[PDB]
Structure 1
Amino acid sequence: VYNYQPCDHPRQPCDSSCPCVIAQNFCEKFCQCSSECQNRFPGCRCKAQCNTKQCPC
């Protein structure tokens, strides 16, 4: 597991041509890609405590 290296490419999907995809890592807030990026990690909507395997994180 590698640290999330940000990618900056507006109006460009991250799919087979992005370092985040090559590293099997999600685009984070620091990534400057489109807000509807494919690899963007959806914020988990836990009620609390985020300690069950239920949360994707």
Structure 2
Amino acid sequence: CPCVIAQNFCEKFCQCSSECQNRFPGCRCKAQCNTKQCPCYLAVRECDPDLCLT
């Protein structure tokens, strides 16, 4: 999987399956997806507005 060999996840535009484990879940955080807990914040990214519906 090019995603895999790239040591990178799958983005919703990948052709990894709709359940391909190489995808990424998305922010769930409650107060702000901002502090040292929120997973997006760790694997430094911005919680996409399709996922962090929280």
Does the TM-score normalized on the shorter chain lie above 0.5?
yes
> Number of aligned pairs?
40
- 1:11-54 deviation per Cα after TM superposition (whole angstroms, max 9, x unaligned): xxxxxxx1111111110111122111111110121113211121
- For structure 1, list consecutive stretches of 5 or more residues without a partner in the other structure: 1-17
Q: CA RMSD in A?
A: 1.2
Report 1 or 2 for greater relative contact order, CA contacts < 8 Å, sequence distance ≥ 6: 1
Higher helix share: 2
Structure 2 residues without counterparts, runs of 5 or longer: 41-54
Larger radius of gyration: 1
TM-score by length of 1: 0.59
Q: Which segments of structure 1 move beyond 6 Å, counting only runs of 4 or more?
A: none
